[PDB]
Design an enzyme around this catalytic site. Structure first.
Site, PDB file in Angstrom:
ATOM      1  N   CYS A   1      42.732  58.244  50.364  1.00  0.00           N
ATOM      2  CA  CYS A   1      43.558  59.368  50.789  1.00  0.00           C
ATOM      3  C   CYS A   1      44.658  59.631  49.858  1.00  0.00           C
ATOM      4  CB  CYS A   1      44.213  58.745  51.944  1.00  0.00           C
ATOM      5  SG  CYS A   1      45.174  60.299  52.929  1.00  0.00           S
TER       6      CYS A   1
ATOM      7  N   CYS B   1      48.099  60.326  51.339  1.00  0.00           N
ATOM      8  CA  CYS B   1      48.866  59.438  52.068  1.00  0.00           C
ATOM      9  C   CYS B   1      48.320  58.039  52.100  1.00  0.00           C
ATOM     10  CB  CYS B   1      49.464  59.976  53.373  1.00  0.00           C
ATOM     11  SG  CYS B   1      48.047  60.655  54.407  1.00  0.00           S
ATOM     12  N   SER B   2      47.320  57.899  53.269  1.00  0.00           N
ATOM     13  CA  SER B   2      46.745  56.325  53.424  1.00  0.00           C
ATOM     14  C   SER B   2      45.622  56.339  54.206  1.00  0.00           C
ATOM     15  CB  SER B   2      47.936  55.606  53.956  1.00  0.00           C
ATOM     16  OG  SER B   2      48.719  56.045  55.059  1.00  0.00           O
ATOM     17  N   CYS B   3      45.012  57.654  54.810  1.00  0.00           N
ATOM     18  CA  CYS B   3      44.148  57.869  55.798  1.00  0.00           C
ATOM     19  C   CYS B   3      42.900  56.701  55.551  1.00  0.00           C
ATOM     20  CB  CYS B   3      43.831  59.124  56.139  1.00  0.00           C
ATOM     21  SG  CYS B   3      45.407  60.057  56.121  1.00  0.00           S
TER      22      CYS B   3
HETATM   23 CO   LIG Z   1      46.522  59.190  54.276  1.00  0.00          CO
END
Ligand SMILES: [Co+3]
Ligand SMILES: [Cl-]
Ligand SMILES: [Cl-]
Ligand SMILES: [Cl-]
Ligand SMILES: [Cl-]
Ligand SMILES: [Co+3]
Lengths: 227, 202, 227, 202
Positions: free
Chosen positions: D107, D110-112
């Protein structure tokens, strides 16, 4: 390098901190003044850096978190330290130890030495400068008024080709002459000069925006192609 | 410091101060620098140089049309003749504000600025907000300086990506009839020579 | 927004800090666990955020220096605070005062309340999720296998169009269906769903690099144009 | 703090901790949250979910060719039938590693990560180094994990820019003749389901 320093077109950095010029203090700590002295004193003697190309890459290599928090003259300290170690003028372990001495005991005395011949040498550099203008046997690839397309290249070393200007149509405004090529010179790989151009870019092309705005950027020949 | 996250932890500004002193001390001990060499540089940039040199050039251009025309035709030759030449001022170009063209200068990649002509840059010029935004939303930036240009004025932003440097020549304001060249120089602000301000009438 | 969060293709961030999975601790401070609870507890009730679009913009709006130093769950705290104040659930001055109380006195007691019906509500959200798949009456503009060009647009609000993918040729890999459109929904401007596509980009096109590498990215229809 | 430079000064992590407690306290006082609601979430993500769910799916695919084929044809339907569905796992796709195709998930923005299937992401997955570099120099990144792919293996990097999520199905290694489905599941590492590792022979 596609680093934290290459900020053109970024969002989120906030308002500009306006200050009246008369109130815009140059230095608030002595070490800031020292930083300035170290940079020019070294560069005037070719120690760690022969010109500004080597200077700039050492700043660009900072950890992002340090780049954003050191304050401006912290960048100058970072690059002097980087370049003197990289070229073998200073040993990293010795430098780190001495740093720790001054951190723990900030009032530690600084050695004094007068060298009036070095002062003259430094003066001469301040006055004569370090023009990067050269001559080459080739002719310029581009002409004033030509529409060019800048390349989509991603150098991992130093470059002066900002990300916001890559893969864009522009128009040649001026052919300056051949200048020392930063992407090589910053890495001590030779002056290898190339023609330098001023190029105008319209807001619609850079951003898709609807304004009577433009940006003039200086670009080396190898950053561009004909259309 | 969790070794997964060393990048969350900036150096304190005390580290940079200590490192500066360490560099100074080592370089002096090894014979590379001297106390007086370091002091000479500081004197030069803090005191000898400054925007009063650009102000002189602007006032001369306002008062002497022949000089203005030569300056705009070949600024490097002219500025060198005046002695406004040196490190980071080897190749200085002057860009003229006009009624429908407003010029603004930046170094998006760092801080580049013509020290021999203008001295050291403003605080804000070196920081990310100005550098990031002025190339993309110059009108919004200029409003934060109090300059609200009409939509019909074209803005040219000059990004100092090479060693070529740029100085803005602002227009002479109303209200200055009969002022001498020296009096006019006192009106020329540093900020007007970057393009973030016009000059107010006295 | 062209913010610090949009890191794809950046240089200078360094080596990845490898750790064995068994040693890769989830939480080292209690407030990190709390952050997680606050996010889901609020979102399950539509407080400050109805889904992840509003969540993400609050992180993206962080000061860059905070984004890089807060640690990951600090982002979660930032966006909960942002969104609850922005929507009027919490008052900023009250929140800042209470923050100061806990900063000065970290052992200050937390009020206790049991609400088993709220627990059930939260569970249901964790289990049912928040699918953004919708139906619209329009047909897709693009088809599998079509070569498209992504736009050169620079939204100043939220977007899911990473900078590294802008103004690039790619090939449609899949038409997912219409999904809630982040660039509107993050700002509470309506779901306004648009067709979502998976798009393949070659390394040569993204970077000018010579590798058998590709990137698959999901892009909303309005991020692209036909060729 | 010099007001020209507030952006040099990060919030300390103690601020985030205090702010978290302030949010908790205010939200509980106002009737928006409860102690048990907050605890329920923590239990779910720290303990109830985890990569063992993905590992079960991988081991089933290795042991049951009919299941593998259905999983790859329509992963969302199949995963939902297994109960591996919920918040941030509404639409999960499985991408198959093969001898000449290696998949890696990120991601960048972000961090998905698909919590219902894999639990919470790795530390490094959320941090800038991995996110910035894996889309541009995946081979260099994978080498930092100990995976040195030949130039002839194609790499596909999957950037999780929408709510669609991706899980890598790694290949079964040599040395696993006669292992049961349950024993095979124990070999499936979290990192192999992101694409940063192959599975070692036992
Ligand atoms: Co993310
Ligand atoms: Cl040549
Ligand atoms: Cl003006
Ligand atoms: Cl429709
Ligand atoms: Cl594999
Ligand atoms: Co600069």
């Amino acid at each position: 390098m596609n680093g934290i320093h290459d900020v053109g077109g970024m969002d989120g950095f906030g308002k500009v901190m306006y200050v009246k010029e008369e109130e815009d203090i140059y230095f608030t700590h002595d070490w800031e003044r020292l930083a300035l002295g170290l940079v020019a004193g070294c560069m005037a003697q070719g120690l760690g850096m022969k010109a500004f190309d080597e200077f700039r890459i050492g700043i660009e290599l900072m950890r992002p978190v340090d780049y954003l928090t050191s304050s401006y003259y912290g960048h100058w300290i970072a690059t002097v330290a980087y370049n003197l170690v990289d070229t073998g003028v200073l040993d990293e372990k010795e430098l780190d130890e001495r740093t720790e001495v001054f951190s723990k005991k900030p009032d530690t005395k600084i050695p004094r030495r007068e060298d009036p011949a070095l002062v003259k040498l430094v003066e001469k550099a301040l006055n004569d400068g370090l023009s990067p203008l050269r001559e080459i046997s080739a002719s310029p690839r581009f002409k004033v008024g030509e529409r060019i397309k800048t390349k989509n290249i991603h150098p991992t070393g130093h470059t002066r080709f900002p990300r916001y200007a890559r893969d864009k149509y522009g128009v040649i405004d001026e052919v300056y002459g051949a200048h020392v090529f930063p992407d090589d010179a910053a890495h001590r790989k030779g002056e290898n000069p190339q023609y330098l151009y001023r190029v105008r870019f319209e807001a619609e092309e850079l951003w898709g925006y609807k304004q009577k705005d433009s940006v003039y950027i200086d670009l080396w020949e190898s950053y561009m192609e004909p259309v | 410091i969790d070794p997964r996250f060393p990048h969350h932890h900036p150096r304190p500004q005390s580290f940079w101060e200590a490192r500066a002193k360490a560099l100074e001390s080592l370089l002096i001990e090894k014979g590379h620098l001297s106390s007086d060499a370091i002091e000479r540089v500081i004197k030069h940039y803090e005191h000898e140089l400054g925007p009063m040199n650009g102000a002189k050039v602007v006032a001369k251009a306002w008062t002497d049309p022949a000089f203005k025309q030569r300056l705009l035709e070949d600024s490097e030759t002219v500025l060198r003749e005046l002695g406004y030449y040196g490190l980071q001022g080897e190749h200085i170009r002057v860009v003229e504000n006009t009624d429908t063209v407003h010029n603004v200068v930046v170094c998006t990649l760092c801080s580049c600025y013509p020290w021999p002509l203008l001295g050291l840059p403003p605080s804000w010029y070196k920081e990310p907000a100005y550098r990031a935004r002025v190339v993309k939303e110059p009108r919004q930036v200029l409003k934060e300086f109090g300059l609200d240009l009409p939509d019909s004025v074209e803005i040219r932003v000059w990004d100092s990506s090479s060693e070529i440097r740029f100085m803005v020549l602002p227009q002479r304001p109303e209200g200055t009839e009969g002022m001498t060249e020296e009096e006019l120089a006192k009106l020329v602000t540093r900020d007007s020579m970057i393009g973030v301000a016009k000059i107010e009438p006295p």
